[PDB]
Design a protein around this ligand. Structure first.
Ligand code: 0VO
Ligand code: 0VO
Lengths: 10, 239, 239, 10
């Protein structure tokens, strides 16, 4: 998944 | 000889990004869950580490060539080099005097024991300090420290990287700017470049040991509940 | 008439457990991520809510009959009544004067606006305060407040409860101790019991609205990363 | 799952 990471990698 | 435009430009990007993601005053540490000297230091260090991760991501997005890699490789690299980049950037606050990370008053000046209260043992904390010392003594220039992190984060040999070929390429282009920089701009760096590459190897041992101790920790829900959603995501294993 | 041994014993257990899990000084609030008046209040309230959940669990384990239920029902009840039990126990710090939860100095004295900075709107915050006021005015005895929470937590009508029959039974045995208590020990509680049961219905509307606003929030990773592992587990939906 | 909750319910 990696919601947060995907999001932070804008 | 001398550095080229593309080479010098990589340096300006890297050095400007490190400045944009690191504060030598640590003003954001007051927003962390306060420290306490049963793993009393866990809450504070989880926030310190969660905070750092965001900073490494902000820094990584600014490394030349990173943005191009696929979302999965950007993630694969971060997830496996995070802990190491944090150890590298944390050296900036390390002090060979007290042998501790001085980020604030008696409150934010972390000793080896303080990290033991986070769930870690000397088996990790010992080499960590040895690495911290060995690195501090290299009195690296801001351009060599920043390049070293960018290089460490572009290791094509990370568990999860698929396009391990372009990642390999971007890292060689950086090891160049560094080797050319030490040789042109750093008076006395004849042995330097090699010592720096060696520090990268010590980080694998450290990154490895931490991984074991952290896995133990994360398996115990009473402790994992102290961690942050980000920390759990970066250090947890999910395809 | 008068209360029986088993009845009075339930009261002693409930009242002693509430004391064991609630501090009228809120001394643990300093260990939370500091408040800030972009959802600036999120970090502090996530810790306030995560903290409360643990306290409700400590309280729930001490309710007579709870421990016997299966692990899944204990979880089903907590996961769906948590937010409501928190709203109930939070009334203890509510103040009809300032219309706010006074837990500390200007720092921990939460207004309606402060919760807006957590990601909630008036559509929830408005009825919440109305409920907080309507409840405060009932000047409940410590034995009625404690019983009301125990009753609210033993609703057999929760999404996930399987043994909804024994849970139904334990709740009736409690509504009795309460009805018998209001009638024997509370001078003027002729209409009381009914008003209390009504507050339980208002909590469903509140528990419902919150659920929608929180779902929105949790869907945005930039915000969910601010929450705590516990909060994410209790309010997230996992069979 | 519910690691934490199971654990807290001791
Ligand atoms: C192994 C490294 C480590 C991880 C432990 C935490 C967990 O593993 C939980 C146990 C993960 C939540 C720990 C050990 C030693 C020192 C340390 O912090 C140095 C500090 C950190 C960062 C910065 C800047 O990013 C500064 C200022 O330069 C100072 C952290
Ligand atoms: C709906 C309720 C609510 C949830 C919002 C947070 C999230 O939904 C994220 C948006 C979940 C992290 C919010 C709204 C109003 C007041 C409030 O706090 C009263 C406070 C709480 C608890 C206690 C004791 O347990 C006291 C002292 O008695 C005071 C909390």
């Amino acid at each position: 998944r990696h919601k947060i990471l995907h999001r932070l990698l804008q | 000889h001398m550095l080229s435009d593309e080479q010098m430009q990589i340096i300006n990007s890297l050095v400007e990004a490190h400045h944009k993601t690191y504060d030598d005053s640590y003003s954001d540490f007051v927003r962390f869950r306060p420290p306490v000297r049963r793993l009393s230091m866990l809450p504070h260090l989880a926030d310190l580490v969660s905070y750092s991760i965001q900073k490494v991501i902000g820094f990584a997005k600014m490394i030349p060539g990173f943005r191009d890699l696929t979302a999965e490789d950007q993630i694969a690299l971060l997830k496996s080099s995070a802990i190491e980049i944090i150890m590298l950037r944390s050296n900036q606050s390390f002090s060979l005097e007290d042998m501790s990370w001085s980020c604030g008053g008696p409150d934010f000046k972390y000793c080896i024991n303080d990290v033991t209260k986070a769930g870690h043992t000397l088996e990790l904390l010992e080499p960590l300090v040895k690495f911290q010392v060995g690195l501090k003594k290299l009195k690296l220039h801001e351009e060599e420290h920043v390049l070293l992190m960018a290089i460490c984060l572009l290791s094509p040999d990370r568990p999860g990287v698929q396009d391990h070929v372009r990642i390999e390429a971007l890292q060689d282009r950086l090891c160049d700017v560094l080797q050319a920089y030490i040789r042109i701009q750093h008076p006395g760096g004849r042995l330097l470049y090699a010592k720096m590459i060696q520090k990268l190897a010590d980080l694998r041992s450290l990154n490895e040991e931490h991984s074991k101790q952290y896995r133990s920790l994360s398996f115990q829900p009473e402790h994992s509940m102290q961690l942050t959603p980000l920390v759990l995501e970066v250090f947890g294993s999910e395809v």
